[PDB]
Write an enzyme that holds these catalytic residues in place. Structure first.
Site, PDB file in Angstrom:
ATOM      1  N   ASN A  38       0.889  -1.119   0.037  1.00 13.18           N
ATOM      2  CA  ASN A  38      -0.065  -0.145   0.030  1.00 13.18           C
ATOM      3  C   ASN A  38       0.648   1.329  -0.187  1.00 13.18           C
ATOM      4  OD1 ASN A  38      -2.545   1.241   0.079  1.00 13.18           O
ATOM      5  ND2 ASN A  38      -2.068   1.914   2.488  1.00 13.18           N
ATOM      6  N   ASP A 103       6.201  -4.495   2.773  1.00 12.64           N
ATOM      7  CA  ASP A 103       4.314  -4.345   3.204  1.00 12.64           C
ATOM      8  C   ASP A 103       2.971  -5.045   2.694  1.00 12.64           C
ATOM      9  OD1 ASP A 103       3.430  -1.413   4.300  1.00 12.64           O
ATOM     10  OD2 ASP A 103       2.152  -2.266   2.493  1.00 12.64           O
ATOM     11  N   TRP A 104       1.815  -4.625   2.556  1.00 13.20           N
ATOM     12  CA  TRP A 104       1.057  -5.775   2.236  1.00 13.20           C
ATOM     13  C   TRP A 104       1.758  -7.145   1.438  1.00 13.20           C
ATOM     14  CZ3 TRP A 104      -1.928  -7.029   5.487  1.00 13.20           C
ATOM     15  CH2 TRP A 104      -1.875  -6.725   7.082  1.00 13.20           C
ATOM     16  N   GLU A 127      10.947  -3.747   4.892  1.00 15.52           N
ATOM     17  CA  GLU A 127      10.006  -3.219   5.397  1.00 15.52           C
ATOM     18  C   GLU A 127       8.496  -4.142   5.533  1.00 15.52           C
ATOM     19  OE1 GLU A 127       8.836  -0.567   6.999  1.00 15.52           O
ATOM     20  OE2 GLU A 127      11.443  -0.646   7.356  1.00 15.52           O
ATOM     21  N   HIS A 269       9.954   3.545   4.828  1.00 13.09           N
ATOM     22  CA  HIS A 269       9.092   2.867   4.510  1.00 13.09           C
ATOM     23  C   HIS A 269       9.740   2.218   3.286  1.00 13.09           C
ATOM     24  CE1 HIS A 269       6.376  -0.874   4.852  1.00 13.09           C
ATOM     25  NE2 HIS A 269       5.261  -0.425   4.361  1.00 13.09           N
TER      26      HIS A 269
HETATM   27  F   LIG Z   1      -0.889   0.302   5.193  1.00 12.60           F
END
Ligand SMILES: [F-]
Length: 290
Positions: A38, A103-104, A127, A269
């Site tokens: 995201n 991330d996702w 990350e 990030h």
């Molecule tokens: F998120």
């Protein structure tokens, strides 16, 4: 750092919906599957892929409801993404893969790996999502914002109405200044507020302080798997980081089997936006020994 996206588009039908993906590199070996999170897309991998494509097939899908993929009328829970990514992998007939994840895209990748361990040849990660025990483990510079994202009404007003995930979180989580050309790439899928549902559901799915319980349990499960898996792992990290601070990357260098870490320098990030060449070059150096 390059701002263009010089990749031929490909589309495949997945559960009745069209998904976009990058597909470059030679087609006769183990493919390298790049999974964004995201609020990004395959665009996040644009400067990393060229390092790997000379030697390996690079496949980089846009998650359902994101990038150039279709926008079905879903709530875009993590489970929705699981179903579409599972079916995307099968639609391309992938057998074994190397994962490159963020991330996702790391929750998706680790959860797929746990369920398909014989099919994962290596994992490069950065990350990535772990359970976050309390809000104190979220960086103070983004604590109130993410708490707002997860507050009824307020979070939707920020993310859906004001487009805060694109407009605020991207620059906040890249060390160097992003350019307008880059921001416009990231803006393209979300010009219409109604299309921003995935961007709001995602932070509401983050496993923080035991909630939502289903995600915490699923992430604990893939982390228990990762801590005992012999799969080769390559972990990129930056200073100060967001999900993975330096001191944690150093612990994981030891607490994950068969793991090497790479310091990219300053990073928050979206590490891919701060040092894509080191990420790509080091993935390329690590692949042949798998
Ligand atoms: F998120």
């Amino acid at each position: 750092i390059g701002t263009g996206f010089p990749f031929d588009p490909h589309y495949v039908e997945v559960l009745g919906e069209r998904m976009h993906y990058v597909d470059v590199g030679p087609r006769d070996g183990t493919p390298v599957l790049f999974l964004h999170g995201n609020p990004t897309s395959s665009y996040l991998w644009r400067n990393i892929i060229p390092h790997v494509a000379p030697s390996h097939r690079c496949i980089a899908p846009d998650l359902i409801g994101m990038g150039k993929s279709d926008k079905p009328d879903l709530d875009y829970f993590f489970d929705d993404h699981v179903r579409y990514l599972d079916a995307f992998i099968e639609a391309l007939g992938l057998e074994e893969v190397v994962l490159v994840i963020h991330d996702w895209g790391s929750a998706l990748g680790f959860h797929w790996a746990k369920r398909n361990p014989e099919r994962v040849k290596g994992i490069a990660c950065m990350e990535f999502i772990r359970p976050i025990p309390t809000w104190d483990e979220w960086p103070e510079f983004a604590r109130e914002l993410f708490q707002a994202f997860r507050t009824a009404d307020v979070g939707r007003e920020l993310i859906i109405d004001q487009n805060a995930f694109i407009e605020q979180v991207l620059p906040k989580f890249v060390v160097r200044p992003l350019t307008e050309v880059e921001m416009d790439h990231y803006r393209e899928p979300f010009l219409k507020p109604v299309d921003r549902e995935p961007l709001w559901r995602f932070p509401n799915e983050l496993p923080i302080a035991g909630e939502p319980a289903n995600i915490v349990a699923l992430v604990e499960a893939y982390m228990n798997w990762l801590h005992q898996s012999p799969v080769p792992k390559l972990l990129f990290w930056g200073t100060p980081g967001v999900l993975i601070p330096p001191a944690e990357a150093a612990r994981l260098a030891e607490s994950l089997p068969n793991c090497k870490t790479v310091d990219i320098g300053p990073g928050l990030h979206y590490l891919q936006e701060d040092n894509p060449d080191l990420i790509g070059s080091e993935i390329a150096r690590w692949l042949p020994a798998l």
